[PDB]
Amino acid sequence: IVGGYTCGANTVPYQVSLNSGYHFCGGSLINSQWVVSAAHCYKSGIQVRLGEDNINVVEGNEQFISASKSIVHPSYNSNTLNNDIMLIKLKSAASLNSRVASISLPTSCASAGTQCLISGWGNTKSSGTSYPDVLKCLKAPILSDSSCKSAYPGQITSNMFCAGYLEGGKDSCQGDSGGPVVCSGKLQGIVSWGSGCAQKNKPGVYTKVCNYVSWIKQTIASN
Ligand SMILES: C[C@H](NC(=O)[C@H](N)CCc1ccc(O)cc1)C(=O)NCc1ccc(C(=N)N)cc1
Ligand SMILES: [Ca+2]
């Protein structure tokens, strides 16, 4: 997260860290057994880390649980990042408490101008690199589809939306991948892609979760 602020420990209790020896992606807890993240985060050897603030220090509220199954969206296209969503089932159910809590799925899509909270442990610099160890947060509005498509001609699909600031300075970034965009209590987006980070006229692009709620619900019910 570039241009954000330190969230505060466990203030984003649905935020998970995906760990394969090291943090590599965010995700969002959607019930005690399931996390949703980005398909571009797919790999083997995933341990889900819940209740994290400092990902380098055991602070006392963590739960570490291995993935038992990962399901990349059936239509994910890695060339275009279309359908960039993946479900991860946990080997055992997380114990839900104030610091480890699910986030609701959309009941409908969200409109341009709606304000959202984006969070993660990704890069905090727009040029060069600096990775924080505590969770960072950013408030950002959803941008119009037309400004999104104008910023990224030939690359925005119906399963994507832009959020952030066209002026630059405030954005998600590498390492925030797969993490949440929460707007009025609903998980509307997943950190997906963009050109650089926090650059002028290059806002963040996010998976449009409202398009996937039926798939998520049916997949969880059958698995
Ligand atoms: C795997 C993904 N790749 C890209 O983003 C490429 N530059 C375009 C892919 C690509 C997409 C569509 C296409 O049609 C072709 C290639 C990535 O690195 N995500 C982390 C990220 C990146 C940016 C931001 C941000 N600035 N908000 C946040 C997290
Ligand atoms: Ca920790």
Curated annotation (Swiss-Prot):
Positions of disulphide bridges: 7-137, 25-41, 109-210, 116-183, 148-162, 173-197
Cofactor detail note: Binds 1 Ca(2+) ion per subunit.
Known catalytic reactions: Preferential cleavage: Arg-|-Xaa, Lys-|-Xaa
Entry-linked PANTHER family: RIKEN CDNA 2210010C04 GENE, TRYPSIN-RELATED
Assigned protein family: Belongs to the peptidase S1 family.
Pfam families, sorted: Trypsin
Post-translation changes: Subsequent cleavage after Lys-125 leads to alpha-trypsin. Further cleavage after Lys-170 yields pseudotrypsin. A cleavage may also occur after Arg-99.
Names of the cofactor(s): Ca(2+)
Gene name tied to this protein: PRSS1
Top EC category: hydrolase
Tissues with expression: Synthesized in the acinar cells of the pancreas.
Protein name (database record): Serine protease 1
Keywords: Calcium, Digestion, Disulfide bond, Hydrolase, Metal-binding, Protease, Secreted, Serine protease, Signal, Zymogen
Catalytic residues, chain numbering: 40, 84, 177
EC code: 3.4.21.4
Cell compartments where the protein resides: Secreted, Extracellular space
Domain of life: Eukaryota
Peptidase S1 domain ranges (all copies): 1-221
